[PDB]
Design a binder for this molecule. Structure first.
Ligand SMILES: Nc1ncnc2c1ncn2[C@@H]1O[C@H](COP(=O)(O)OP(=O)(O)OP(=O)(O)O)[C@@H](O)[C@H]1O
Ligand SMILES: [Mn+2]
Lengths: 124, 268
């Protein structure tokens, strides 16, 4: 579905990747933070945590996650916490394992970002 | 300590649904009430036990500026962990200040609100230990039939209730945006919240209204974002607001210290 899109529609894929860069910068720039590379910039879980708060209307106390993660483990925990916030916002449990995000699997990352886009289309 | 029987509740009209669950206006045992229905993902026996242990502390009947939780329905056997409190005709301080289409409260009433809240907080600060996860803000204070402001015990967050999400960071002390509660002087953190309430009573504006909650918490915590002290106010109100919002938590007064200051401001 999204896989068919990832694997067999490169022209669409870039239009979609384009959609996503605009979609995520719409929000993170408010924190003076920019996303230029979808492939890695969400790997450590921080932006996903900050994005969820920007998207669902709350602040995340800095003691609730690792703002500057110091290990693979802390990144995993951040992604997992972000995935929990996603489910609190009403999304079904994400298909990728938190490790897949941290390991920079592009399909996995884009799936998560795509499901966010399709949910949070109209948020300003 | 079996709590309130959920089946006895008369649900009259739904007032809200949000991240926490829902709120209804209702009736129970001749009381006009609101019913807060908490929706919780991965509800467990541990969380249920926790709810039943946390609720009793909110049943505070001994201070006129504290609005008790009347009781709670344990879940099971109730469909959802639920709590009840008296219906307050004017709703929240936030409603009265920011959403008051009928009338605008005058500054004398604003001073009385500040005094009511200070008295209520001084009382709550006598409790040992403090009630956990109690945050002071204009949404968590109610206004009764006679314009008495009352701290909303039904607004105290449960251990399982949106942990790691703050929906009203604008009233939170900078240290409290970043440090675990155990690592802060909670009473000083609460005085910061009161200082923001003072600012809100003076401006009749929502603090940082042009910013999202995530922007607010990130900028106050890490960029030094502060309310600007309003111009054209007495040196006395100015001095009070300043000391309550001291960057140094240790230098902020206690509530019991500002009570007499507020009392003199009604009528010296
Ligand atoms: N005791 C009460 N009497 C009358 N109205 C109330 C009372 N408590 C709350 N309300 C009203 O119900 C509205 C919704 O409150 P609700 O608790 O659902 O949301 P909230 O306080 O913004 O968020 P939270 O779920 O974190 O407590 C409030 O804005 C207020 O107008
Ligand atoms: Mn509430």
């Amino acid at each position: 579905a999204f896989d068919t899109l990832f694997d067999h529609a490169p022209d669409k894929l870039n239009v979609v990747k384009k959609t996503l860069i605009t979609f995520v910068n719409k929000h993170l720039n408010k924190l003076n933070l920019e996303v230029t590379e979808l492939e890695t910039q969400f790997a450590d879980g921080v932006y996903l945590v900050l994005l969820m708060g920007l998207l669902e209307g709350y602040f995340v106390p800095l003691h609730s996650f690792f703002l500057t993660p110091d290990s693979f483990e802390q990144k995993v925990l951040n992604v997992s916490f972000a995935f929990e916030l996603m489910q609190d916002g009403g999304l079904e449990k994400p298909k990728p394992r938190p490790e897949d995000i941290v390991n920079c699997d592009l399909k996995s990352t884009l799936r998560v970002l795509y499901n966010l886009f399709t949910k949070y289309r109209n948020v300003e | 300590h079996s709590g309130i029987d959920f089946k006895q509740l008369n649900f009259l009209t739904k007032l809200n649904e949000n991240h926490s669950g829902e709120l209804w206006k209702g009736r129970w045992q001749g009381n006009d009430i609101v019913v807060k229905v908490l929706k919780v993902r991965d509800w467990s026996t541990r969380k249920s036990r926790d709810f039943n242990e946390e609720c009793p502390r909110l049943r505070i009947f001994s201070h006129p500026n504290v609005l008790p939780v009347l009781g709670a329905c344990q879940s099971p056997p109730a469909p959802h962990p639920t709590l009840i409190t008296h219906w307050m005709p004017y709703g929240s301080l936030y409603n009265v200040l920011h959403e008051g289409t009928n009338f605008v409260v005058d500054q004398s009433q604003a001073v009385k609100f500040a005094l009511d809240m200070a008295r209520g907080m001084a009382f709550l600060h006598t409790l040992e230990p403090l009630i956990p996860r109690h945050a002071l803000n204009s949404r968590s204070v109610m206004i009764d039939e006679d314009m008495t402001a009352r701290i909303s015990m039904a607004d105290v967050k449960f251990s399982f209730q949106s942990p790691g999400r703050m929906y009203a960071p604008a009233w939170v002390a900078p240290e409290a945006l970043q440090k675990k509660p155990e690592d802060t002087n909670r009473r000083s953190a609460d005085m910061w919240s009161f200082a923001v309430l003072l600012w809100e009573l003076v401006t009749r504006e929502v603090p940082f209204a042009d910013l999202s909650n995530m922007e607010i918490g990130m900028k106050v915590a890490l960029e030094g974002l502060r309310p600007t002290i309003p111009p054209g106010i007495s040196p006395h109100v100015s001095k009070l607001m300043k000391i309550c919002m001291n960057e140094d938590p240790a230098k902020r007064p206690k509530f019991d210290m500002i009570v007499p200051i507020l009392e003199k401001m009604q009528d010296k």
